[PDB]
C-alpha cells in the first residue's frame, strides 16, 4: 500500500490522475518526483519552472552546482538530486524536445530511467512545451516503465482524452 489517492489504474504498474504535480508532490511527499528537465537543468517553465518555483529556487541553485561539476545531461538521460520540500529525491529526466528537433525515439530511453526507482510521481515526458504528442508519451510510458508510476496530467481536457483513447 502507498499514499497516492484518486488515481485511475491503467495497467499493472501505471496509474494516472488529473493533478498539478507540484500540489501532488506537496501532499504526498513521494520518495521520487520526476522533473521534465533539459540537459542544462535550466528550470524556466512548465514542470521544471513550476517545481523549481515551489522550492523557492533551491532546485535551480543545486542544479547549477551539478552542471558546473558534471556538465550537461544527455537527451534521454537523467540525474538524481534533492527533492527539496517536494519529495525525498527529484529524478531530472531529459525527454527529447520536438521544438529543438530531437529524435522522438529517445523518449523510450528517457522513460527507462524510471525503472531504477520502485515508485515515482511524474509528468508525461516530452509532453507540454517539449512538443511531443502526449498520447504517444503515455503509450511509451506503459510499454517501457515496469516500476510503479503515478502520472499527474495537468490539462483536464488532455487527461480525459488520454483515458478515453487508452488501449
Interface ranges with ligand 5OF (CB under 6 A):
36, 46-47, 123-124, 127-130, 134, 153-155, 158
Nearest approach, Cβ of 33 to ligand 5OF (angstroms)?
13
Question: In Å, how far from its chain's centre is CA 24?
Answer: 13
Question: Toward ligand 5OF, which CB reaches closer, 114 or 154?
Answer: 154
Min separation Cβ 155 and ligand 5OF, Å: 4
C-beta of 48: minimal distance to ligand 5OF in Å? 8
Which residue in 98, 63, 112 sits closest to 83, CA to CA? 63
DSSP state of 40: T
Nearer Cβ to ligand 5OF (68/98)? 98
Q: Which of 122, 72, 126, 116 is nearest to 95 (CA)?
A: 126
Q: Which is nearer to ligand 5OF, 65 or 96 (CB)?
A: 96
- Closest residue by beta carbon to ligand 5OF: 128
CA distance linking residue 54 with residue 124, whole number of Å:
19
Shortest Å, Cβ 69 to ligand 5OF: 26
Beta carbons of 39 and 95 less than 8 angstroms apart: no
Longest Cα separation, the chain: 45
Residue 13, phi then psi, degrees to nearest 5: -125, -5
Minimum gap (Å) between residue 1 Cβ and ligand 5OF: 26
Give 83 or 134: the residue with its C-beta nearer to ligand 5OF: 134
Amino acid at each position: 500500500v502507498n499514499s497516492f489517492s484518486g488515481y485511475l489504474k491503467l495497467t499493472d504498474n501505471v496509474y494516472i490522475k488529473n493533478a498539478d504535480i507540484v500540489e501532488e508532490a506537496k501532499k504526498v511527499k513521494p520518495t521520487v518526483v520526476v522533473n521534465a528537465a533539459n540537459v542544462y537543468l535550466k528550470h524556466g517553465g512548465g514542470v521544471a519552472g513550476a517545481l523549481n518555483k515551489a522550492t523557492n529556487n533551491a532546485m535551480q541553485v543545486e542544479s547549477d552546482d551539478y552542471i558546473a561539476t558534471n556538465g550537461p545531461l544527455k537527451v534521454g538521460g537523467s540525474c538524481v538530486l534533492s527533492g527539496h520540500n517536494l519529495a525525498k529525491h527529484c529524478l531530472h529526466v531529459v525527454g527529447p524536445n520536438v521544438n529543438k528537433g530531437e529524435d522522438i525515439q529517445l523518449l523510450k530511453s528517457a522513460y527507462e530511467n524510471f525503472n531504477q526507482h520502485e515508485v515515482l510521481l511524474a509528468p508525461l515526458l516530452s509532453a507540454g512545451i517539449f512538443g511531443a504528442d502526449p498520447i504517444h508519451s503515455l503509450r511509451v510510458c506503459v510499454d517501457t516503465v515496469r516500476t510503479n508510476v503515478y502520472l499527474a496530467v495537468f490539462d483536464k481536457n488532455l487527461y480525459d482524452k488520454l483515458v478515453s483513447s487508452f488501449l
